[PDB]
Amino acid sequence: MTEYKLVVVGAVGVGKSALTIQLIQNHFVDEYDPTIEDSYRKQVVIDGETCLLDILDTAGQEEYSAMRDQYMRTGEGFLCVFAINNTKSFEDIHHYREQIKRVKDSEDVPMVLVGNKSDLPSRTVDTKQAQDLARSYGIPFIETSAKTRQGVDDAFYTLVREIRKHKE
Ligand SMILES: CS(=O)(=O)Cc1nc2ccccc2[nH]1
């Protein structure tokens, strides 16, 4: 049972808890709790490899800056979760990605881009805007709603595969 550390980083109003809990105990929480640091751990069968996935839900407040470098250095994977109900958060990803590069010290990093609330009718961002951009970076774009549970496991399995490819 190999250990995999996945840190969840997103913006405010994305509902990261709705994604994490949906995978942990398969529960959808509509409520928005001010998460500071929530530890999660789940055992999944990655294409046959049952491993231990360590997940940490961080805060979305800019107040935590000095502690940012701390968790970003121990995180094997970075779960960039944003909501397509806001076009501002789509730009904030660049700030995070650019910073992550500074903490990773490498251009090669198994990261993907996902968008929650893809089931909301207030969708102001289209998939093309994300696909075209993701094409440039060369990163797989996966759209999964944590409300209806559409390819949730698949989105996590793909990430682990990317990490394994980097390892070996
Ligand atoms: C039970 S735990 O070890 O606190 C959960 C966790 N999730 C993580 C993600 C990245 C790095 C360390 C991480 N630790």
Tokens of 61: 């407040």
**Domain extent for 96:** 3-167
Q: What's the CA gap between 96 and 124, in Å, rounded?
A: 21
Given its phi and psi angles, is residue 72 left (phi above 0), alpha (psi -120 to 50 degrees) or beta?
alpha
Check the CA dihedral 13-128-134-151 and report its sign. positive
Distance CA 160, CA 67 (A): 25
Two structure tokens written together for 73: 């250095």
Report whether 113 contacts 83 (CB < 8 A). Answer: no
Q: Which of 56, 71, 103 should be mutated for ligand 1, with most atoms under 8 A from CB? A: 56
**Rounded to 5, what percent of the chain is helix, strand, coil?**
35, 25, 40
Beta-ladder partners of 33: none
Judge if the beta carbon of residue 42 lies within 6 A of ligand 1. Answer: no
What single DSSP character describes residue 83?
E
Quote the ligand 1 centre to 67 CA distance (angstroms): 14
- Residue of 19, 23, 54, 46 whose CA lies nearest to 35: 19
- According to DSSP, the residues that pair with 79 across neighbouring strands are 8, 112
Edge-to-edge strands, sheet with 112-116:
37-46, 49-58, 3-10, 77-83, 112-116, 141-143
Quote the CA–CA distance of 162 and 32 in Å, as a whole number. Answer: 31
Number of the ligand 1 atom closest to the C-alpha atom of 76: 10
Q: Are 58 and 64 in contact (CB under 8 A)?
A: yes
CA-CA distance, 61 to 57, in Å (whole number)?
A: 12
Kindly give, in sequence order, each residue whose CB lies less than 8 Å from that of residue 78, ignoring residues fewer than 6 positions away: 6, 7, 9, 72, 96, 100, 109, 111
Whether ligand 1 lies within 6 angstroms of the CB of 55 is answered as yes
Closest-CA residue to 94 (of 58, 130, 122):
130
C-alpha 20 – ligand 1 centre gap (Å): 13
Does the Cβ of 5 fall within 6 Å of ligand 1? yes
CA 89 to ligand 1 center in whole angstroms: 24
CA torsion, ordered 79, 83, 84, 89, to nearest 10 deg: -80
Cα 7 from Cα 98, distance rounded (Å):
16
Instruction: State the Cα–Cα distance between residues 95 and 149, nearest whole angstrom.
Output: 29
Residue 77 CB–ligand 1 contact under 6 Å: no
Indicate the number of domains in the chain: 1
Question: Which method, experimentally, gave rise to this model?
Answer: NMR
Q: Residue 81: enclosing H or E segment and its boundaries?
A: strand 77-83
Distance of CA 135 to the CA centre of its chain: 18
Tokens for 9, please give them: 């980083």
Q: Provide the token pair at 60.
A: 């979305």
- Give burial (CB, 10 Å; 0-12/13-18/19+) of 95: exposed
CB of 26 closer than 8 Å to CB of 7 = no
CATH number at residue 92: 3.40.50.300
